[PDB]
Design a protein around this ligand. Sequence first.
Ligand code: NAG
Ligand code: NAG
Ligand code: HG
Ligand code: HG
Lengths: 103, 103, 201, 201
Amino acid sequence: HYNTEILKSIDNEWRKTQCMPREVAIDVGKEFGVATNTFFKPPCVSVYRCGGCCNSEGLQCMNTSTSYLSKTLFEITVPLSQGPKPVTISFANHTSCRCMSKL
Amino acid sequence: HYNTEILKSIDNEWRKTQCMPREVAIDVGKEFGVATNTFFKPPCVSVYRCGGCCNSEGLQCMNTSTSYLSKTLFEITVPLSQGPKPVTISFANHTSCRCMSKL
Amino acid sequence: RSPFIASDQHGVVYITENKNKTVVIPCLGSISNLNVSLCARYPEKRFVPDGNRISWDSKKGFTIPSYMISYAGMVFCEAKINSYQSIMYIVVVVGYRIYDVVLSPSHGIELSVGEKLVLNCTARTELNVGIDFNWEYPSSKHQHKKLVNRDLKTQSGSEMKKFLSTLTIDGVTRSDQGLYTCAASSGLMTKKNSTFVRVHE
Amino acid sequence: RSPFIASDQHGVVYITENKNKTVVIPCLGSISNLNVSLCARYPEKRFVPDGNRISWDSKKGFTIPSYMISYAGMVFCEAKINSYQSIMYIVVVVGYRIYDVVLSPSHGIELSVGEKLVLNCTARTELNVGIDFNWEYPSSKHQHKKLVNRDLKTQSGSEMKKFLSTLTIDGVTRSDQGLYTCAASSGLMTKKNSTFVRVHE
Ligand SMILES: *[C@H]1O[C@H](CO)[C@@H](O)[C@H](O)[C@H]1NC(C)=O
Ligand SMILES: *[C@H]1O[C@H](CO)[C@@H](O)[C@H](O)[C@H]1NC(C)=O
Ligand SMILES: [Hg+2]
Ligand SMILES: [Hg+2]
């Protein structure tokens, strides 16, 4: 019946929205929380963080294991006396997630 | 030289972080901004929204064309006198993005 | 067609506060000699009887300590001879506790005809709770009344939910003088609170 | 090896405020009779000379109105006979304007020995701007000094950036009495502001 049409879509919805690692852009100078006079090129990095929804409030989406990754970005500082300098920064990369209890 | 190794990774970084449509979970009862006594099952829907970074502040990532999508979710209300009722909600789905000037 | 027989094409399961801590999925079977497991998602988890604690009786359905399926969006029992399954049961985790109902201002409301009355009722509750408000006031004779219900963010992240209902009368009159009682209702539990609004010249 | 000849394996391009509004990518060529285009990313955009406005001269490199490549992370010219390309030039969009430098408190700072002095310098600027602070105060003789620089969020979304530098002296002494001048520097442009801090018994 038409009920299967609704059921199909809704199970699919739960699947696509679950607590899992998701590719997101991270503003670099915000995680590092650098400075008033420091710019990054590129401004961001592509890394995987845990997102999605838990069915019970009191469970939130948290990573259970994390890799770290060293990416290389050109750092610009002002007043520009240089010189974009190749710097490396180590970003957290989540490899597993679970809806774990809040407290 | 080793400079190609840094260049390869950095161009790849710009590519993965650009202003483009991205699959995200949307808390339903927050977009609809429903009520104190209204719960949704599932809590979320999988839809595409514009994310990524613009290289110049004064350009932000905005969608240039939007589809809309009707998804069906069971709505629960309290005090529970029913009865999860199959309701439909129309969610915006972005199909193109561009770093457009802020003002 | 199927060993499982249970109204609609989908059922509902409510995790209310323990004990027993065990919840029953009515996976009533047509046969007795069946090895039934409980499939929950998402993510996929399978649960197998470990008598005594997790069990499936052909007359009662599946029985599991509800903490194991609280995470889940939906469950269904699965029996195989060579794989049949039950109907999807939606998991609804349901809170009921209201910690405190507080009005603002709390005491001694003195007003003069024409003034604006603004009552803020606030209910603070445990998680997985929603609230319906029901007010009681002198002038049920309708005169410039307004009610707005809001979600305030406990987080904090505490372990709670905070709800706000706001009564508003633009030009109070002497008929409006009396007891104002805001009721907060979560599931079955209901807590009330009141203040006296005084109106004179 | 290549028609393009330009120090490092990557170059830099700065979009400073117009006019000309046109920026020059030094894609100096070995030959004259080459059809060169400017490739920018991301996303991919190709730009072709439309003399006169967009042009490539074998002695000057590529010339484009900078609004067309401001969006870009990086650019490079591309010439083909049957496809060669230049080195990657990183696009840096660079602001310079400071609207106002304001201190807090602004006027009449009266203090007594031992008291805490807290100066808040705030610079408000156009977009694509970063600022370096440089303070000037009576006691360059170091005594319990502290400087913290912060980003405050204009947004709002206005069209600006707001920066905060905070001077702190825990136990002011009479040596510390005098002129305090906070300097904000963005690119080349620099704006200064001052207040008098008075210390007595
Ligand atoms: C939990 O309580 C129910 C009451 O219906 C009872 O039948 C069941 O045996 C209880 N569990 C245990 C382990 O006693
Ligand atoms: C822009 O100014 C430069 C100055 O170096 C000049 O050579 C160029 O011709 C100007 N553009 C126009 C259209 O006049
Ligand atoms: Hg299963
Ligand atoms: Hg290209």
